[PDB]
């Protein structure tokens, strides 16, 4: 577990190359930001998923903020970072020796709606029917997000019935519609206060459109959170 360090405080944009000779072990990145703000942090293709920790300065305290460790699970982190404190990034095992890159970007736009949470990239929604996704559950009042695309071709008209719900943990969901420009994501907050635990209400969403569900855990009844996205037409 070789701890590496970005000695220079990063600002706005930064790219850190994984050596490749540390891929056969879980390994850490120590860094700080030039200015307090909300950052998007991710591996090259959002793979692997990353964990982030807060470090108080011989250290005083280390606190898990957000992120999980599921193999082959795509995700990116959106986190408020303070310039006064230190931060660790746990990169898991790249059991494939391709060189990875950790990208840090300062967010000035709508993506700020996603702090603090990991955003799971869902890419297996090719059809109607049942789908579910299991991740380690955030504690109460903490967030986990999901970015997905409704199956079908987009025509601003074709639409699917989306049933979003959880298995055991209660959570409050906020649903955003995603658009993108040269300056990153734009988010339209289309729904709030969605109680996920055994939710029986469906939502009609546009085929081929991109959406993000931000979930606030309000009741931890299981170590894992399992989000169901059942699609009908």
């Amino acid at each position: 577990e070789n701890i590496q360090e970005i000695n220079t405080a990063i600002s706005d944009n930064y790219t850190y190359n994984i050596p490749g000779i540390v891929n056969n072990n879980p390994f850490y990145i120590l860094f700080t930001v030039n200015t307090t703000g909300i950052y998007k942090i991710n591996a090259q293709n959002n793979l692997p998923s990353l964990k982030i920790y807060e470090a108080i300065g011989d250290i005083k305290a280390i606190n898990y903020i957000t992120g999980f460790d599921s193999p082959n699970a795509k995700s990116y982190l959106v986190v408020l970072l303070n310039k006064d404190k230190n931060y660790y990034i746990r990169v898991p095992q790249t059991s494939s020796n391709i060189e990875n890159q950790i990208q840090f970007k300062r967010e000035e736009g709508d993506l700020r709606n996603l702090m603090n949470s990991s955003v799971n990239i869902i890419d297996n929604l090719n059809s109607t029917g049942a789908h579910y996704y299991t991740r380690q559950s955030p504690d109460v009042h903490d967030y986990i997000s999901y970015e997905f695309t409704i199956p079908g071709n987009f025509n601003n008209k074709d639409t699917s019935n989306i049933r979003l719900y959880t298995s055991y943990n209660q959570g409050i969901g906020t649903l955003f519609r995603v658009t993108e420009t040269i300056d990153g994501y734009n988010l339209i907050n289309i729904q709030q206060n969605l109680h996920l635990l055994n939710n029986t209400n469906s939502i009609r969403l546009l085929n081929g459109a991109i959406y993000i569900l931000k979930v606030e855990v309000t009741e931890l009844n299981n170590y894992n959170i399992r989000l169901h996205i059942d699609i009908t037409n």
Partner: protein, 143 residues
């Protein structure tokens, strides 16, 4: 390496039809049957200095998508009217805003439809208010 609209040759379609392709016809731009010809191919290039995009016809490489003084999309020599700010709202679907703002209004490519039929209709530059107007949505498909 840029995932947002990488440089290169594209087809340009309206979401009303996946078989009608944008091409120049007598000074005006319109969506016509597949030609397998160079005039339906469009070279999209990002300009870092302006943070926008310019789009040329590959049959007429010096001709870019612009607009005249009456709200019609045209083909013309390179100028500030040729600068486009795309908004991706779906997989390959874009709303193309002009870099230039008149009033405090944004203007976008707009195609008329007759019950989702766009044949013979000319490409216009019209006011844009939201991301829900079907006539302002266009597919740019790499080739």
């Amino acid at each position: 390496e840029r995932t947002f609209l990488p440089n290169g040759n594209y087809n340009i379609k309206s979401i009303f039809s996946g078989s009608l392709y944008l091409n120049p016809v007598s000074k005006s731009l319109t969506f016509s049957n597949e030609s397998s010809a160079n005039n339906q191919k469009w070279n999209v290039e990002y300009m870092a200095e302006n943070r926008c995009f310019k789009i040329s016809n590959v049959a007429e490489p010096n001709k870019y998508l612009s607009y005249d003084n009456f709200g019609f999309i045209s083909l013309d020599s390179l100028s500030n009217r040729c600068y486009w700010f795309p908004i991706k709202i779906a997989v390959n679907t874009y709303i193309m805003l002009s870099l230039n703002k008149v009033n405090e209004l944004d203007y976008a490519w707009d195609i008329y439809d007759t019950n989702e039929n766009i044949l013979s209709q000319p490409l216009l530059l019209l006011p844009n208010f939201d991301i829900y107007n079907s006539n302002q949505m266009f597919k740019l498909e790499k080739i």
